[PDB]
PDB file of C-alpha atoms and ligand atoms in Angstrom:
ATOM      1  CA  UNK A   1      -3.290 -15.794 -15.467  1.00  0.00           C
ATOM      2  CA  UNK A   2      -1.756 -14.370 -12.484  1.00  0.00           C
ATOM      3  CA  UNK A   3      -4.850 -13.713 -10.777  1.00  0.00           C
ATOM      4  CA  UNK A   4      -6.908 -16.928 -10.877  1.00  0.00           C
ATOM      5  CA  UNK A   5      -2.892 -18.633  -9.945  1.00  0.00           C
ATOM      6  CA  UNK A   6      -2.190 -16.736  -7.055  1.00  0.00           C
ATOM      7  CA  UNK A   7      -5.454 -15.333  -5.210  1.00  0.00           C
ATOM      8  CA  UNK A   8      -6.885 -18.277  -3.438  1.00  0.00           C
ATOM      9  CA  UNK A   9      -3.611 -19.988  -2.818  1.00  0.00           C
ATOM     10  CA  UNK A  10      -0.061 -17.754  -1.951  1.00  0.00           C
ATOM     11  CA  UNK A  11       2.410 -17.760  -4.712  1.00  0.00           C
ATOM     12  CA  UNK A  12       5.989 -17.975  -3.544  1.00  0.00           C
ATOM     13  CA  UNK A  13       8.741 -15.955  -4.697  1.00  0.00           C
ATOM     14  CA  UNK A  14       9.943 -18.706  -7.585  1.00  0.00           C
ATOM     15  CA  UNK A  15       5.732 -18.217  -8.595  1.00  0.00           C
ATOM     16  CA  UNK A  16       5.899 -14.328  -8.993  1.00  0.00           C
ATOM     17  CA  UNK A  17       8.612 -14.476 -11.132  1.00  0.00           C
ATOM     18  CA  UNK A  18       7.383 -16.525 -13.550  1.00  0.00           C
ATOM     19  CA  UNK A  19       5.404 -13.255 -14.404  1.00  0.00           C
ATOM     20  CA  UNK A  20       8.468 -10.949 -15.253  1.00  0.00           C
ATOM     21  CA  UNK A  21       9.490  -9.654 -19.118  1.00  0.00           C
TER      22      UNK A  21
ATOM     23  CA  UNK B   1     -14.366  -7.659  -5.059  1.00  0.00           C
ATOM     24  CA  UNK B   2     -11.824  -9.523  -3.490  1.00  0.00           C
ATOM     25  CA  UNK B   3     -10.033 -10.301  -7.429  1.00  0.00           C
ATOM     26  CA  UNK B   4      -9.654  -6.270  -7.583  1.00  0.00           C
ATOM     27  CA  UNK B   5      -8.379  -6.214  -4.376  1.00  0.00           C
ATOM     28  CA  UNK B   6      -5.844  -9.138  -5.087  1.00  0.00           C
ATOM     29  CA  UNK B   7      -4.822  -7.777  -8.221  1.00  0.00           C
ATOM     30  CA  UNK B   8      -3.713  -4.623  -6.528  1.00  0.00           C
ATOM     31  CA  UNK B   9      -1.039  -6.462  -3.788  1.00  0.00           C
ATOM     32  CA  UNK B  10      -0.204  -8.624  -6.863  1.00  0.00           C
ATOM     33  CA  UNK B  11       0.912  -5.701  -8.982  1.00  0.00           C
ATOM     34  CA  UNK B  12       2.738  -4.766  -5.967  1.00  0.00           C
ATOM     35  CA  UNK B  13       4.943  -7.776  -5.505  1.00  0.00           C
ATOM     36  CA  UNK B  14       5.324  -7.784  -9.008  1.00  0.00           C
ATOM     37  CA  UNK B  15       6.734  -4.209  -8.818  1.00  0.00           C
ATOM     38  CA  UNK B  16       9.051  -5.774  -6.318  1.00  0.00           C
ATOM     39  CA  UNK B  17      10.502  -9.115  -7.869  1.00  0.00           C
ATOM     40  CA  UNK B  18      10.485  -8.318 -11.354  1.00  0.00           C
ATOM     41  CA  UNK B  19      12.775  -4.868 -10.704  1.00  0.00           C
ATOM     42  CA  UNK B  20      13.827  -2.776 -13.204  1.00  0.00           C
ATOM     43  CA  UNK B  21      12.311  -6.047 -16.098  1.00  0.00           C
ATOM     44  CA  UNK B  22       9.087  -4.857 -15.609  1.00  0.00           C
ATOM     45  CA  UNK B  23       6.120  -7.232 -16.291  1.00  0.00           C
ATOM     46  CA  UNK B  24       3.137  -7.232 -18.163  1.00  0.00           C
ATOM     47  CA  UNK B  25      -0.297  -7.245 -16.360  1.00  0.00           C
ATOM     48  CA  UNK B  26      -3.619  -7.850 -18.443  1.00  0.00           C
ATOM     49  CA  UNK B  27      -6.677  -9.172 -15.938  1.00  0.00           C
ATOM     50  CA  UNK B  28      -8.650 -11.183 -18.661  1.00  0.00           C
TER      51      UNK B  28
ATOM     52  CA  UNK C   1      15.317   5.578  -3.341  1.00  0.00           C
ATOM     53  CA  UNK C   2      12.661   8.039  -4.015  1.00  0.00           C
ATOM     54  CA  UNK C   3      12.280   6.829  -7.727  1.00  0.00           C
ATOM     55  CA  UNK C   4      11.756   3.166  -6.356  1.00  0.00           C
ATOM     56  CA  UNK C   5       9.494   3.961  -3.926  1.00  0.00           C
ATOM     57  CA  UNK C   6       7.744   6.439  -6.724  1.00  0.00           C
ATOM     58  CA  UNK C   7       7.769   3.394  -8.832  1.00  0.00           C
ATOM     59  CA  UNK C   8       5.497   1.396  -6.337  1.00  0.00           C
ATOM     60  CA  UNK C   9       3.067   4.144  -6.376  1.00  0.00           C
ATOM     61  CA  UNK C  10       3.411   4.534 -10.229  1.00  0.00           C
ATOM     62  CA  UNK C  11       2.150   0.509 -10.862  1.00  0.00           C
ATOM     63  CA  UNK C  12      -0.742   0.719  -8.261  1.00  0.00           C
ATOM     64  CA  UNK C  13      -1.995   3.976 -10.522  1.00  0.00           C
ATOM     65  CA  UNK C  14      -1.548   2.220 -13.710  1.00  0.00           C
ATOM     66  CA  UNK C  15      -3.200  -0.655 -12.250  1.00  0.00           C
ATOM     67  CA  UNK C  16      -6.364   1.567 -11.425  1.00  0.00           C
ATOM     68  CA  UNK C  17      -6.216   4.106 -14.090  1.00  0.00           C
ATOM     69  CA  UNK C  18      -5.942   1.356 -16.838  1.00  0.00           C
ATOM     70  CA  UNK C  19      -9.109  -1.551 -15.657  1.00  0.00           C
ATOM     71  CA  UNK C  20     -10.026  -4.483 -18.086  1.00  0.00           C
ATOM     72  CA  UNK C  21      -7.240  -2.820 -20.461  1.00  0.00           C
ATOM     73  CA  UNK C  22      -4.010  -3.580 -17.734  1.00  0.00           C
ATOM     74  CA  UNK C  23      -0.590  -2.518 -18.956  1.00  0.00           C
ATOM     75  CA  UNK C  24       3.021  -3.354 -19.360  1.00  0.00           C
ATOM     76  CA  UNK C  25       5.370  -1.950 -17.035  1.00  0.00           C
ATOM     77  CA  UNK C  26       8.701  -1.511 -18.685  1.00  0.00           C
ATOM     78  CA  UNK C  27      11.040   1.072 -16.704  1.00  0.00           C
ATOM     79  CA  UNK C  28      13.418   1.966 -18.973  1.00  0.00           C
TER      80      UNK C  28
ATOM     81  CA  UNK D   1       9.895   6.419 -19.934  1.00  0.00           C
ATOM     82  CA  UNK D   2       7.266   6.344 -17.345  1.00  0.00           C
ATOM     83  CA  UNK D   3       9.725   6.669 -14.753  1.00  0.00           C
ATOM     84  CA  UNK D   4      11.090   9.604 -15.844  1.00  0.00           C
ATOM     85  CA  UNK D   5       7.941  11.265 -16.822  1.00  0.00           C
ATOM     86  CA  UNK D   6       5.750  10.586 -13.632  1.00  0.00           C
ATOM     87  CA  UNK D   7       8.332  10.521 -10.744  1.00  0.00           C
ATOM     88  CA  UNK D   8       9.834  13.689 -11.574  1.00  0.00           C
ATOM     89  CA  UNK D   9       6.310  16.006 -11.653  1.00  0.00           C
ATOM     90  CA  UNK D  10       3.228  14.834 -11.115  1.00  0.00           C
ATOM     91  CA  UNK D  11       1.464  13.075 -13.973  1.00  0.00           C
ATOM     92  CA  UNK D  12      -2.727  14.019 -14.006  1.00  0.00           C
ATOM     93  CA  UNK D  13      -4.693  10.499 -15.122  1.00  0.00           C
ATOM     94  CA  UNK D  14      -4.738  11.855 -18.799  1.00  0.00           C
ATOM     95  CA  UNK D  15      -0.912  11.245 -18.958  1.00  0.00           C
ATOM     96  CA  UNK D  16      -1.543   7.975 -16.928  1.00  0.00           C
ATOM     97  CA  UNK D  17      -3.771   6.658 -19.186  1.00  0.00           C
ATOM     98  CA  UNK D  18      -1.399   7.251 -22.069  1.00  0.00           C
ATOM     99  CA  UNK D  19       0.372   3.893 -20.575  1.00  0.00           C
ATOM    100  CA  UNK D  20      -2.495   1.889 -20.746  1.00  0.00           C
ATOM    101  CA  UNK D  21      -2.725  -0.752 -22.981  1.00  0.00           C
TER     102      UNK D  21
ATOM    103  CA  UNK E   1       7.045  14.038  -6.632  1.00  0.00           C
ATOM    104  CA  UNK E   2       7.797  14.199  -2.528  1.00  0.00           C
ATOM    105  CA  UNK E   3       4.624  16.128  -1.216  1.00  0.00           C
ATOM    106  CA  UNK E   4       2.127  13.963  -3.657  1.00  0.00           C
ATOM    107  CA  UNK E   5       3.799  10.402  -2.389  1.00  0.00           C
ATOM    108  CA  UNK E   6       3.736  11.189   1.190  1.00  0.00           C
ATOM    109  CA  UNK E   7      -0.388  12.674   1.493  1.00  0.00           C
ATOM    110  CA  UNK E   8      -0.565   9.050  -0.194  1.00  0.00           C
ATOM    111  CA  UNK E   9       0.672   7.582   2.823  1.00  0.00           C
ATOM    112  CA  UNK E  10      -1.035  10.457   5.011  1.00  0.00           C
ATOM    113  CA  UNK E  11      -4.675   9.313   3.782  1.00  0.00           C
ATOM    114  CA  UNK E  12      -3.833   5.316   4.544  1.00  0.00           C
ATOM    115  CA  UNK E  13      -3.040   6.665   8.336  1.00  0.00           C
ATOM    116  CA  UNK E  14      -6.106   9.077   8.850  1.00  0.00           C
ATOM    117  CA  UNK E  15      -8.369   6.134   7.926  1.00  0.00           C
ATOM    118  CA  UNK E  16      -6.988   3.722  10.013  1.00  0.00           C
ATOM    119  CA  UNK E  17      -6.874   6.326  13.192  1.00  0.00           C
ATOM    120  CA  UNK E  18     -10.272   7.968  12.490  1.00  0.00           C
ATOM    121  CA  UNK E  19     -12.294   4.634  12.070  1.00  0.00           C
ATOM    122  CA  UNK E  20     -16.080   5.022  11.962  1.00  0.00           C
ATOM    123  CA  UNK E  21     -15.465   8.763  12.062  1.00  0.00           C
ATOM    124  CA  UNK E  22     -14.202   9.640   8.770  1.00  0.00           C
ATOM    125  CA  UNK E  23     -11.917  12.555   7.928  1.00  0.00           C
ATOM    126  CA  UNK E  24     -11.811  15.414   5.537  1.00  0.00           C
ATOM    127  CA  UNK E  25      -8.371  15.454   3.144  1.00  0.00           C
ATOM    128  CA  UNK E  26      -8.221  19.055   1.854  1.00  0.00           C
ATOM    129  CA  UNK E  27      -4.132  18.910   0.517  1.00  0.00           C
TER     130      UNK E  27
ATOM    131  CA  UNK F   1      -3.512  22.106   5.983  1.00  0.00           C
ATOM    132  CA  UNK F   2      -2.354  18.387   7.800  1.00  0.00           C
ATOM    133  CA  UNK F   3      -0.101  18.312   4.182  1.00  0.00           C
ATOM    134  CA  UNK F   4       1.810  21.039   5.586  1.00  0.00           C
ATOM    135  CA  UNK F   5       2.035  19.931   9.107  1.00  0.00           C
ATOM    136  CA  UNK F   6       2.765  16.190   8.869  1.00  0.00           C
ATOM    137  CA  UNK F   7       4.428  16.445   5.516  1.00  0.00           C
ATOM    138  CA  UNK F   8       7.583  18.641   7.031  1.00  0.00           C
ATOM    139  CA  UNK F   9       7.563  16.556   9.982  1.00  0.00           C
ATOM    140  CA  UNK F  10       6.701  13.121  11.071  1.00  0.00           C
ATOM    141  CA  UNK F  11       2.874  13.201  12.930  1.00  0.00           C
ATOM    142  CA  UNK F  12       2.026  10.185  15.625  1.00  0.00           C
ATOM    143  CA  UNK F  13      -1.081   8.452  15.494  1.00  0.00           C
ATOM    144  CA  UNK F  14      -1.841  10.809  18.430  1.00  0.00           C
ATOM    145  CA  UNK F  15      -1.051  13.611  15.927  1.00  0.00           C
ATOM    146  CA  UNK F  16      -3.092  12.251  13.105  1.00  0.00           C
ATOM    147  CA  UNK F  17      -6.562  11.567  15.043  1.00  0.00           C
ATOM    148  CA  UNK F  18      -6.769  15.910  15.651  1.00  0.00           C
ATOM    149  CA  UNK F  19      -7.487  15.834  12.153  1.00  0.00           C
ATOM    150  CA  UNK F  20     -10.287  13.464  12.323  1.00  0.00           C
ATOM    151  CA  UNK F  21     -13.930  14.366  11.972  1.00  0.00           C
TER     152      UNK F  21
ATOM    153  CA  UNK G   1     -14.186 -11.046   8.264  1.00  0.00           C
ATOM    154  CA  UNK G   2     -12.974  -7.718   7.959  1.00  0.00           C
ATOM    155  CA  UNK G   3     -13.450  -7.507   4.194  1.00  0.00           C
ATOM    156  CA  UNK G   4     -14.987  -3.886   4.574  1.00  0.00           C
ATOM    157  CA  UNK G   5     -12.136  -2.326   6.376  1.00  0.00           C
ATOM    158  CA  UNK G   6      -9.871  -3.743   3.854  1.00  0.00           C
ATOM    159  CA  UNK G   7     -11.906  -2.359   0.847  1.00  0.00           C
ATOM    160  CA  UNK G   8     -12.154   0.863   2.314  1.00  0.00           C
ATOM    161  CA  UNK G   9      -8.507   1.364   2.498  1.00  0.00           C
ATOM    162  CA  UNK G  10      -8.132   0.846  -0.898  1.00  0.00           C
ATOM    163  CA  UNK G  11     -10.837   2.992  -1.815  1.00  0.00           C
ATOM    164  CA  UNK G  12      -9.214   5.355  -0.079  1.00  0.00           C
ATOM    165  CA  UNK G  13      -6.002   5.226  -1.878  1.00  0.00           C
ATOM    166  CA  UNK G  14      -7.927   5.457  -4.897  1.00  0.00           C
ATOM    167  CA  UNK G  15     -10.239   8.684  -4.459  1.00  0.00           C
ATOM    168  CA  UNK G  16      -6.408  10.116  -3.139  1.00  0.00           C
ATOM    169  CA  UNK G  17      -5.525   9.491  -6.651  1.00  0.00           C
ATOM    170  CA  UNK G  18      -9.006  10.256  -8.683  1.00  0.00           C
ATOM    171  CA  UNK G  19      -9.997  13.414  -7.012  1.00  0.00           C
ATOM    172  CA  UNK G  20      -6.878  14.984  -7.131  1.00  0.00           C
ATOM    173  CA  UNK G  21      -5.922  18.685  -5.606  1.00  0.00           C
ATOM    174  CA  UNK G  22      -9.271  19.214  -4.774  1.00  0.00           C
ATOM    175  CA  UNK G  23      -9.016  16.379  -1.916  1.00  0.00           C
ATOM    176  CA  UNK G  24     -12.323  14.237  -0.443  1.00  0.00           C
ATOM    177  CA  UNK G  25     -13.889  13.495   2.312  1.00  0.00           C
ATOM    178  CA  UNK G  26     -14.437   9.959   4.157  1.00  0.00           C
ATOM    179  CA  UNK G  27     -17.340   8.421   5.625  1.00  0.00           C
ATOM    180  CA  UNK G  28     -19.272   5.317   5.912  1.00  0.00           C
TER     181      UNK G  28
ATOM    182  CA  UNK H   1     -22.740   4.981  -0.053  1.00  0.00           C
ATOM    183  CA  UNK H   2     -19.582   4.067  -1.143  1.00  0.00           C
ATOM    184  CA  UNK H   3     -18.472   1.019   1.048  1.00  0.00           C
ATOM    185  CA  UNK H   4     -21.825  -0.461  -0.260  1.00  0.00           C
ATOM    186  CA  UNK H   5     -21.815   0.222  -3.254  1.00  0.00           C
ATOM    187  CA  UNK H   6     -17.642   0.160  -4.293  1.00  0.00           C
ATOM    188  CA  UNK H   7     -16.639  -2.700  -2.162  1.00  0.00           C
ATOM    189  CA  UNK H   8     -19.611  -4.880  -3.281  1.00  0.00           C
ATOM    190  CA  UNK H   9     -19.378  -4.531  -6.713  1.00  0.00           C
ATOM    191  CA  UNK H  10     -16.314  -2.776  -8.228  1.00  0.00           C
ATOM    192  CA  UNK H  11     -16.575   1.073  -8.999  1.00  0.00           C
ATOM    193  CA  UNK H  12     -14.091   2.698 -12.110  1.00  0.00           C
ATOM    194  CA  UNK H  13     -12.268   5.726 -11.191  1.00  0.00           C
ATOM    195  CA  UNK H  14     -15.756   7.344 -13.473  1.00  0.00           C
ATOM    196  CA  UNK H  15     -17.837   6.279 -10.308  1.00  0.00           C
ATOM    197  CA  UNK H  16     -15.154   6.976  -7.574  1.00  0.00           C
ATOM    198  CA  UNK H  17     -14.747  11.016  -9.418  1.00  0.00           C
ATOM    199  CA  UNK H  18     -18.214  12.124  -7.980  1.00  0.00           C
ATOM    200  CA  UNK H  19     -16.953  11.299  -4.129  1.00  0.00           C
ATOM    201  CA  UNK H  20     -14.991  14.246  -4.420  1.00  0.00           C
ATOM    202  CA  UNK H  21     -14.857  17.592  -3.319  1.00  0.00           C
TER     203      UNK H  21
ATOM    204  CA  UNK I   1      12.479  13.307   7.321  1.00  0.00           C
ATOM    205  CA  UNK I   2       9.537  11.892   6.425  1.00  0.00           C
ATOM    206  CA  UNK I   3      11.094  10.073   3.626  1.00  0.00           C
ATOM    207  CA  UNK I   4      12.274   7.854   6.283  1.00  0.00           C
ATOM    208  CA  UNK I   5       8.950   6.935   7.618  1.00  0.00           C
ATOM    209  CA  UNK I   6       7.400   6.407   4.297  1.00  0.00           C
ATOM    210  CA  UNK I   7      11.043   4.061   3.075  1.00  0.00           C
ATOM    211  CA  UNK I   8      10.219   2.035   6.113  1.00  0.00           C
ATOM    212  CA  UNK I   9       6.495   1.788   5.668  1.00  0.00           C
ATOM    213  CA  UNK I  10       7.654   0.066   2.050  1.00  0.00           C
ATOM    214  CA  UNK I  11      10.619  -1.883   3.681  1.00  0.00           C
ATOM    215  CA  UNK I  12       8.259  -3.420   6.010  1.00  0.00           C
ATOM    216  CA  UNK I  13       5.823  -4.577   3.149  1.00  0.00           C
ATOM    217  CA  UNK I  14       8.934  -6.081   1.530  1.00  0.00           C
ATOM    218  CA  UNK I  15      10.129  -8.112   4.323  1.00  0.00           C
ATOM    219  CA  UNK I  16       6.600  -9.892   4.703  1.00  0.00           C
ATOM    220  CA  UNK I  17       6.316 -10.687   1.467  1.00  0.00           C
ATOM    221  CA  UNK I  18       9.882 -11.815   1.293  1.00  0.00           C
ATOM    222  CA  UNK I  19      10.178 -13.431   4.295  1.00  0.00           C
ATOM    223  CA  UNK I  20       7.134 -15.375   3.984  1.00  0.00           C
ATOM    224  CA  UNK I  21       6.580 -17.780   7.213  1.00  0.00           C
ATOM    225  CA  UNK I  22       9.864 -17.088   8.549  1.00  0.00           C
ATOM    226  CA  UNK I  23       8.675 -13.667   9.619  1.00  0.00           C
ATOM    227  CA  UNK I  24      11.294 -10.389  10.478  1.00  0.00           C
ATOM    228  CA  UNK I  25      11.895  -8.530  13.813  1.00  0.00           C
ATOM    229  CA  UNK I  26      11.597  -5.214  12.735  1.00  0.00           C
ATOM    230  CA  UNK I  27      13.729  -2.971  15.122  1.00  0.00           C
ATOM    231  CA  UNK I  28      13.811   1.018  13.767  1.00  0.00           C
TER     232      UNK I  28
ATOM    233  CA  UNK J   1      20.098  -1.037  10.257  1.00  0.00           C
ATOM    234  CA  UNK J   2      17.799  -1.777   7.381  1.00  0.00           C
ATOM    235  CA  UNK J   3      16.867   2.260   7.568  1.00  0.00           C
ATOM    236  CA  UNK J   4      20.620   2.756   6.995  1.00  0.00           C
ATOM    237  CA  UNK J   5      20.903   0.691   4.850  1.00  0.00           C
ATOM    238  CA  UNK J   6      17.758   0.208   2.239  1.00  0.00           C
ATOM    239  CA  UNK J   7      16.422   3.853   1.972  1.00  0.00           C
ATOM    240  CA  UNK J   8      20.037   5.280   1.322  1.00  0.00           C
ATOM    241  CA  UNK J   9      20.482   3.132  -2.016  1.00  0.00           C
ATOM    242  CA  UNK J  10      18.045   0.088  -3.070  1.00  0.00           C
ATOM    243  CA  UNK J  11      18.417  -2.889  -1.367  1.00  0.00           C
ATOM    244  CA  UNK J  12      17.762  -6.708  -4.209  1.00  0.00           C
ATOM    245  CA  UNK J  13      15.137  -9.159  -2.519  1.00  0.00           C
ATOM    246  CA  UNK J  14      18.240 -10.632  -1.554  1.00  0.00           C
ATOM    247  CA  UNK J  15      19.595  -7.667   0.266  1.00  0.00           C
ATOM    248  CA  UNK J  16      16.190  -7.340   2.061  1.00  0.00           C
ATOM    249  CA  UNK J  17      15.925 -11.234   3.123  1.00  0.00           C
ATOM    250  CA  UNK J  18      19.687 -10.382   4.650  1.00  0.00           C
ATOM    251  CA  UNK J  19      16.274  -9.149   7.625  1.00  0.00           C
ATOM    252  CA  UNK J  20      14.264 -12.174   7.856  1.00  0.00           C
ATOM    253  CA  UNK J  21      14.311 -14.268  10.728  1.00  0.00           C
TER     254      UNK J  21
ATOM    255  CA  UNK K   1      -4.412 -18.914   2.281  1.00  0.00           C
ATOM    256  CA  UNK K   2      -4.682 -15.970   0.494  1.00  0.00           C
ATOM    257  CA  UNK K   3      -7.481 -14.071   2.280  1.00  0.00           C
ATOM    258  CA  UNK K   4      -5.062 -14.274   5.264  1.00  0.00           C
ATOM    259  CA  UNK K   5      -1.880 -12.777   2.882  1.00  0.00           C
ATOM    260  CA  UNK K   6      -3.602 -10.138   2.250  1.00  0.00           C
ATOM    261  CA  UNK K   7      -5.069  -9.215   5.758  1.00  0.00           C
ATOM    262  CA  UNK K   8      -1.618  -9.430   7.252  1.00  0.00           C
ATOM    263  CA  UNK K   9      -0.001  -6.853   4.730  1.00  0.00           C
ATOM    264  CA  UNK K  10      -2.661  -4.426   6.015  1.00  0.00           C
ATOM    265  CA  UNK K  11      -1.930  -5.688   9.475  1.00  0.00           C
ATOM    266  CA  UNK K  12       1.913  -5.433   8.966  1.00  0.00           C
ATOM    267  CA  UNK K  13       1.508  -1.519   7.886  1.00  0.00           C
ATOM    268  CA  UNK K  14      -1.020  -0.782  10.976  1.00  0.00           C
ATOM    269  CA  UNK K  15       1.512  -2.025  13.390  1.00  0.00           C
ATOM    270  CA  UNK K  16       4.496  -0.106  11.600  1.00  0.00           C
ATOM    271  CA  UNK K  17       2.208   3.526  12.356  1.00  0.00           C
ATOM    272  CA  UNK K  18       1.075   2.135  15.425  1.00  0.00           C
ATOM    273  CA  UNK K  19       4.392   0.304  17.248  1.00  0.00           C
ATOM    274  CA  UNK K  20       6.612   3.532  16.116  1.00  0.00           C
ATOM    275  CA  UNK K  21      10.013   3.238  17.610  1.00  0.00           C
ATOM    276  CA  UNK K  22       9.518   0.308  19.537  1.00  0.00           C
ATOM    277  CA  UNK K  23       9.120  -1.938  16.405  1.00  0.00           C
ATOM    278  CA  UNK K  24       6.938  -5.400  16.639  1.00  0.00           C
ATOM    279  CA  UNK K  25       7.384  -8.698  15.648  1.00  0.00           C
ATOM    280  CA  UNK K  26       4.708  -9.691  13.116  1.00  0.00           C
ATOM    281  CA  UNK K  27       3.501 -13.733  14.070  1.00  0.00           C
ATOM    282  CA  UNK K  28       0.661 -15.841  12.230  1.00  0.00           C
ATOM    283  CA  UNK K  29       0.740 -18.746  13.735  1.00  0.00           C
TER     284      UNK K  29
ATOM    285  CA  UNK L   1      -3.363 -14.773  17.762  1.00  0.00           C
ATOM    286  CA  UNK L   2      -3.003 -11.524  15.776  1.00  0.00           C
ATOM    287  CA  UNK L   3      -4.426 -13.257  12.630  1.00  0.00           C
ATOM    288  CA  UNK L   4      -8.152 -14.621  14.924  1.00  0.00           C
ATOM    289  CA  UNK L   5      -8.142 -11.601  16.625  1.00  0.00           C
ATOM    290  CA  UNK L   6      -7.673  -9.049  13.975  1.00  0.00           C
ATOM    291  CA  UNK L   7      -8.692 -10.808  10.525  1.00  0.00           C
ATOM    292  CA  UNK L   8     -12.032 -11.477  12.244  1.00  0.00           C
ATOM    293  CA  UNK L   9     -12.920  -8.243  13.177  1.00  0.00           C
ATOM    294  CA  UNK L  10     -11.666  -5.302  13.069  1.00  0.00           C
ATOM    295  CA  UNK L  11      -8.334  -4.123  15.961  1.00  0.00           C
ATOM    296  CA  UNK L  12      -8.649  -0.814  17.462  1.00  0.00           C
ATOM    297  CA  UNK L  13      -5.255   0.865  17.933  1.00  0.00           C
ATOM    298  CA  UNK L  14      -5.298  -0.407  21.318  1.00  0.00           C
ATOM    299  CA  UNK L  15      -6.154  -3.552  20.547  1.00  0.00           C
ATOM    300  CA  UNK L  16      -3.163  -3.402  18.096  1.00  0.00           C
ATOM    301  CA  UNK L  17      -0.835  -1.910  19.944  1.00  0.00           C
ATOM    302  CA  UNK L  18      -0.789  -5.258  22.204  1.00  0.00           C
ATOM    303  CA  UNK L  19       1.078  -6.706  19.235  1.00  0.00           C
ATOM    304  CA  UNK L  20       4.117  -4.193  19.364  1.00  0.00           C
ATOM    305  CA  UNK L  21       7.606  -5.213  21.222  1.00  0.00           C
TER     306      UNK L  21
HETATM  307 CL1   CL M 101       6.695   6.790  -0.724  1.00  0.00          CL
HETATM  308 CL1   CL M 102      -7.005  -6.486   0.762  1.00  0.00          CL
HETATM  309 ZN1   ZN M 103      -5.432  -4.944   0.541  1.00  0.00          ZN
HETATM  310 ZN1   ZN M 104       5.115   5.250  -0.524  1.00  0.00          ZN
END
C-alpha cells in the first residue's frame, strides 16, 4: 500500500496518482 | 508513530492530486 | 475556495475519526 | 455527499464516522 | 463552516508560538 | 475568547503569544 | 530529531477535533 | 502525559477524549 | 479576511509538495 | 499574485506549479 | 528522504506565520 | 542549512525568522 510505498522514500507526483479512483 | 504521522500528509496530498476523483485509503 | 480548503480539513478528520477501518473519499 | 453535508455545518464525529468504512 | 476551519489553524499557531509553555483553547 | 479576536481579524505571532500560558 | 515537536502538532490538531466546543488545554 | 504516551505509541480519538476540558 | 491567511497557509503546502526540489519564492 | 489568483477560484496542480521556481 | 518531507512541510507552514508579509524562500539543500 | 539546523532540533521563532526574505 501507499504507506509502506511512500514513507521511507518520497513519492513523486506520477507516484500519488497511482492512488486515485 | 511515524506511519500515523505519514499517513496523515499522505491523505493530504492525496486530497490534492486526486481532486474532485477522490481515492480510497485503507492502512492494512 | 472555502469548500476546497473545507475538503482538506474534511480527509484529515476522516483519516482520524475512521483508524484501522480508513475510508473512501468520493466528493460527489 | 460528504461535501455537502460537512462543509456547510459542522458535522460532530457521529456523522463523521458514518463515512468510515 | 468558517469559524470551525480557522480555530483549526488558530491551535497549529498557539503551539508553535507558546512552545514549552502550553496554552489554553477555550473557543 | 482568542476565536473572537483573531477569527475577525488576522493576529501576528506577537498577537498570538498574549494568549499563551 | 525533532520527532516530538512534530507529534505534538498533530496531536494538537486532533484534540481540536475530538474535544470539540468544550476546547483543551496544552502542556508537556 | 500525552507526548509520552500519544507520540510513542499511537492513542485513538477514545484516549485523546479524556485530554479535554 | 482571514480567509486569506488560512488560503495561503494551504497554497504554501501545495507549492512544496508540487514543486518538489525546485522550490517557490513565495512573495504575499 | 497566487493570493489573487488561487483563493478567488481553485487553481489544478498545474495552475499552482505556474509558482515554482 | 521522507523523514526530511515531512519536517519541511511543518517547516514551510512555521515560516508562512512567522515571515508574514515579507515572504521567504524555502531551501533544502 | 534550514533542514540541519531546524530538523535537528527544534527553531525558535527567532531562530526561524533568519530564514525569511
Ligand atoms: Cl481553511
Ligand atoms: Cl510529521
Ligand atoms: Zn507532520
Ligand atoms: Zn485550512
Amino acid at each position: 500500500g501507499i504507506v509502506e510505498q511512500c514513507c521511507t522514500s518520497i513519492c513523486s507526483l506520477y507516484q500519488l496518482e497511482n492512488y486515485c479512483n | 508513530v511515524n506511519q500515523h504521522l505519514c499517513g496523515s500528509h499522505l491523505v493530504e496530498a492525496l486530497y490534492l492530486v486526486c481532486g474532485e476523483r477522490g481515492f480510497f485509503y485503507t492502512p492494512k
